[PDB]
């Protein structure tokens, strides 16, 4: 009986909530009350990368911390040398409605996808003078919201159908499907160990997934509204979640619950994008209002604002060396930021 | 002053920027359109008629390129997505117009009113004008002439509603058909006029299932949308 199964699900939800509350020994704010504040993080736009015609919808940094891919709904996937502002590639997409792109850790490939329901994989190191499609991963039944390479052969993808999939790029097939979400999956972040990933969805839950087992380890459900953006904390033991509810929230895998929430009453715009700084001390969040707020991830206070955009910040990524944060926006500009001594 | 590798990188950047200039020209000369409508709406017959007259099963987006005079139109039909649209619809913030096709003959059209209200009031789709194709006008004519279903059962306002003197009926259509047509239109216009505040406009059109005028209708009211945008940025409207 579904009524009895619903009652058992309520019983297990109560048991889980009780186990969470038993682990709430003390809050993060209490533990970090006596750590020194981050202070005012002023950052300057060191580069404005201009050349996209439409709104930029996604970014990814290369592991080299120099090359940056950005996807715009004009149907150009542009690869930028951040140091020089030079455009290294501009790839004509077969569908303009790109919503995600990924840079492979090897730099050999970029992926992108969107309303085509396809993750197109682009070989950047062909003998040809221009980039070619290596593979078109065609099994999703909704829009590609995020994609992230595990390796040159494996890409995790998230979709508007409430499902992630792990793809073998050489075979072109789903090695695994991640089905437990109940709304549009909006964001992925791969753990640093690459074995776990967390995906946030319109259900307002985040879920932890094992790429090898194909199963949900944990569901995190503190958010009120759609989790537009998710980012692993660099230790791999916590992750931040941005939502339409205008809050970020920090979840720890092992505490199985919200450590902290980042919100200000003046912030009524949903979170579009989240990234940590290399130490994890800064949570950079992009907003529907044209700002990125830098949060002290330990103290939950606003260390600063990246105020340089003229439309919705769409994507936000810190280099793997932590040296710069790029910020794409619907203003078609791709602003790259760093501090000063 | 550049090293030979920096020189070759700048030369590649310049060739890419030249290609991006050419694609800026092609892109900015194209009117992008989002085609919305319930499965009962003849939006499929609209894409079919325009695909014929002018210019992978998981594929979540269908593009039909069509051309009117020299203006290129790319019209996008969102096919293989889920019923939840609130995220993917945000992609279309930039489109010149949304073509919202309504099955005027099916009094399920209160769902079409609710979808129109949502599209019209969304924070990312305000400033986008809606080309409202009140389709299946022939089926609506048959439906109201047969009299087996009556709009006041679905909209109590229709018992009071009187046809506006602005109405320009076809010479042969019955005044009951006109009153039904313009009531449906005026419900969509009620939604459009509640909250547009002049940032975006609704363009009702009465279309038959196949009606070759529709591409001209979209051309005319795209030209009107672009004129209104220009007048707005000149502060003249």
């Amino acid at each position: 009986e579904l009524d009895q199964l619903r009652q058992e699900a309520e019983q297990l939800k109560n048991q889980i909530r009780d186990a969470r509350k038993a682990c709430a020994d003390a809050t993060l704010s209490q533990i970090t009350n006596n750590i020194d504040p981050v202070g005012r993080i002023q950052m300057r736009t060191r580069r404005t990368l201009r050349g996209h015609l439409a709104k930029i919808y996604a970014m990814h940094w290369g592991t080299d911390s120099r090359l940056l891919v950005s996807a715009s709904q004009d149907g150009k996937l542009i690869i930028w040398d951040s140091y020089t502002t030079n455009k290294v590639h501009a790839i004509p997409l077969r569908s303009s409605w790109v919503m995600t792109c990924a840079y492979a850790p090897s730099g050999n490939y970029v992926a992108c996808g969107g309303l085509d329901n396809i993750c197109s994989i682009y070989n950047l190191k062909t003998r040809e003078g221009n980039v070619r499609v290596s593979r078109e991963l065609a099994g999703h039944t909704g829009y590609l919201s995020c994609c992230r390479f595990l390796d040159d052969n494996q890409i995790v993808t998230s979709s508007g159908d409430t499902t992630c999939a792990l793809w073998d790029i050489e075979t072109g097939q789903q090695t695994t499907t991640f089905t437990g979400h109940t709304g549009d999956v909006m964001s992925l972040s791969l753990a640093p160990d690459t074995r776990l990933f967390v995906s946030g969805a319109c259900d307002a839950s985040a879920k932890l997934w094992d790429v090898r087992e194909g199963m949900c380890r944990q569901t995190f459900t503190g958010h009120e509204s759609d989790i537009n953006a998710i980012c692993f904390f660099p230790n791999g033991n916590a992750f931040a979640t941005g939502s339409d509810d205008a809050t970020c929230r920090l979840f720890d895998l092992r505490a199985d619950q919200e450590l902290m929430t980042y919100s200000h009453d003046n912030i009524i715009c949903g979170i579009t994008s989240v990234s940590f700084s290399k130490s994890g001390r800064l949570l950079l969040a992009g907003y529907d209002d044209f700002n990125c707020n830098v949060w002290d991830a330990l103290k939950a206070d606003r260390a600063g604002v990246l105020a340089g955009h003229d439309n919705r910040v769409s994507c936000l990524g810190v280099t793997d060396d932590g040296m710069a944060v790029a910020t794409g926006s619907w203003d078609s500009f791709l602003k790259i930021w760093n501090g000063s001594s | 002053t550049l090293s030979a590798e920096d020189k070759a990188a700048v030369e590649r950047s310049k060739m890419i920027e030249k290609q991006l200039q050419k694609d800026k020209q092609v892109y900015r000369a194209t009117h992008r359109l989002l085609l919305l409508g319930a499965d009962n709406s003849g939006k499929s017959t609209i894409v079919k008629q325009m695909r014929i007259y002018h210019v992978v099963k998981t594929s979540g987006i269908f593009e039909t390129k069509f051309q009117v005079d020299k203006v290129n139109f790319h019209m996008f039909d969102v096919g293989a997505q889920r019923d939840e649209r609130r995220k993917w619809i945000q992609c279309f913030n930039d489109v010149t117009a949304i073509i919202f096709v309504v099955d005027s003959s099916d009094y399920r059209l209160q769902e079409a009113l609710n979808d129109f209200k949502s599209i019209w009031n969304n924070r990312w789709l305000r400033t986008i004008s809606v080309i409202l194709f009140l389709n299946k006008q022939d089926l609506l004519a048959e439906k109201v002439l047969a009299g087996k279903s009556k709009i006041e059962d679905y909209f109590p306002e229709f018992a009071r509603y009187t046809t506006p003197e602005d109405a320009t009926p076809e010479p042969g259509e019955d005044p009951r058909v006109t009153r039904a047509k313009y009531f449906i239109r005026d419900e969509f216009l009620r939604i459009s006029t509640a909250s547009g505040d002049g940032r975006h406009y609704c363009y009702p059109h009465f279309t038959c299932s196949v009606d070759t005028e529709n591409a001209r209708r979209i051309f005319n009211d795209c030209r009107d949308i672009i004129q209104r945008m220009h007048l707005r940025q000149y502060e003249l409207l």
């Epitope: 709304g183 759609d226 | 019923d83 939840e84 949502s118 009031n121």
Partner: nanobody
Framework: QVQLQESGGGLVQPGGSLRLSCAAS????????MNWVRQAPGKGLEWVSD????????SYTGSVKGRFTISRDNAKNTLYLQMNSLKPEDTAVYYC?????????????????????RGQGTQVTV
Amino acid sequence: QVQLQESGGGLVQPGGSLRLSCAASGFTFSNYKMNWVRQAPGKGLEWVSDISQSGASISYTGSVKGRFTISRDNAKNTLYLQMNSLKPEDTAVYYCARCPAPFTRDCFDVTSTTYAYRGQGTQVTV
């Protein structure tokens, strides 16, 4: 977590009256526009009424306009539907559906075949 729990639905004589009530938990209810949505057994899911953050804006379907009133007690995080003069047309599972985002009026997806911010629904038979 976001859970919506409708109550008060049951059998009623035609022309009878029921107050449905949803207890909302896990969100700042005051910030979200609220809806009632119903699925009659023979047809798809259909919207019924909506209420703004304050109740300053309210609307209904034409089946409902005079018969039902939607109201909210933001202090009790609870939404009501005073269904007067129920007809056999009104027999449906009634679902209370939150809007997706706070501070907004776009009402998207509340009628979707699956939607996260909607309760399990209360059966009303007339």
